[PDB]
Amino acid sequence: KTIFVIVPTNEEQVAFLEALAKQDELNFDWQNPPTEPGQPVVILIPSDMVEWFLEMLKAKGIPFTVYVEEGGS
């Protein structure tokens, strides 16, 4: 599992993330919900979805930072 810390810059991106969090089939683990622009959103992402999510965030212009376990897989 990789951690993404997302910080949406506007309401469109907050809305995209709320919609996305409705999709249980992605198997994403949302640690807190999106709220407002500039409020960080923490998600634990299965390894096999990180590339999909990178490109998705990249395509939507959504700022983020990725975190991995210290000395892990």
- Minimal CA–CA distance to 1: which of 45, 37, 38, 39? 45
Q: Which of 15, 42, 55, 56 binds its own copies (CB under 8 A)?
A: 42
Least separation in angstroms between CB 19 and its own copies: 20
Cβ distance 34 to 21 under 8 Å?
yes
Structure tokens at 26: 């992605």
Distance CA 16, CA 53 (A): 13
Which H or E run contains 41?
A: strand 41-45
| Between 19 and 60, CB nearer to its own copies | 60
Task: Please tell me whether residue 40 binds its own copies under the rule CB under 8 A.
Answer: yes
Q: Which of 12, 38, 47, 63 binds its own copies (CB under 8 A)?
A: 63
Binding site for its own copies (CB under 8 A): 3, 5, 29, 31-32, 40, 42, 44, 57-58, 62-73
